[PDB]
Curated annotation (Swiss-Prot), chains A, B:
This is Oxidized low-density lipoprotein receptor 1. The cytoplasmic region is required for subcellular sorting on the cell surface. Changing residue 43 to Q: Does not affect glycosylation state. Changing residue 101 to S: Abolishes sorting into the cell surface and binding to acetylated LDL (AcLDL) while increasing N-glycosylation. Changing residue 53 to L: Impairs binding to acetylated LDL (AcLDL). GO terms for biological process: blood circulation; immune system process; inflammatory response; leukocyte cell-cell adhesion; lipoprotein metabolic process; proteolysis. Disulfide bonds join 4-15, 32-122, 101-114. Homodimer; disulfide-linked. May form a hexamer composed of 3 homodimers. Interacts with HSP70. (Microbial infection) Binds to the head and beginning of the coiled stalk of N.meningitidis adhesin A (nadA) variant 3; binding can be abrogated by monoclonal antibodies against the specific regions of NadA. Binding occurs in protein microarrays, in solution and when LOX-1 is expressed on the cell surface. Changing residue 89 to N: Does not affect subcellular location but displays a reduced affinity for acetylated LDL (AcLDL). Abolishes binding to acetylated LDL (AcLDL).
Amino acid sequence: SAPCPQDWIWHGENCYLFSSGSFNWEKSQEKCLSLDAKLLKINSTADLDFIQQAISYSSFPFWMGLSRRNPSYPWLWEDGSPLMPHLFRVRGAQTYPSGTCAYIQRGAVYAENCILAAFSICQKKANL
Amino acid sequence: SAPCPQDWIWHGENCYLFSSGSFNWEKSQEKCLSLDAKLLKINSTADLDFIQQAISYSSFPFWMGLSRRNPSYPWLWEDGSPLMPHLFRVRGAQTYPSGTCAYIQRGAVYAENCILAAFSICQKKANL
């Protein structure tokens, strides 16, 4: 009956977890899925503000659920929805084996080869 | 009926919050008290493990509720209880205007002049 499990952070309709380790994007995604969760989807200004404040203590890169299959396609979340207009810019964006993915670091969002390893943030719906 | 409020982390019987800013120890304590909380008290190996993992993404110093009135006295938590034998060592420990206080940084615990500013961690009991 708790909104979120222990060790997660409850914010609004969702629960958030920082990953215990640093892995490539696909593996990061698999680990979120194992927890009945998904990689972070930043869907509003409120979400962006919450995430930026939460990572404000860290200089680490964190994978989110935003990617593009090849440099010719737009940025989409894992659910297929596009990046919300004017929410944030993806900095630093090329062709890699498994596409390009986005991470957030110091509040700013960057494009990177999905094969490289980073920490990640997972989210799932809160029990409300 | 939620164990902890939004933006806090629930762990065991308690809820934890990282401070929104960096202040001297007394002010940090006052801010925890305003939230119906207290500065962090690390009372067990389980607590230490939880806190070390939680701050593992950060190189910031965080004040906890451990202090000594002058360099001649032992380290006590705010509730008056002593530091648990063999839990951790207080590194780097002198006379300052308002005593000496302890902060945790990169998992290790350090002595510092209580007048200097740091982030802090607050805790309160979870509604279970």
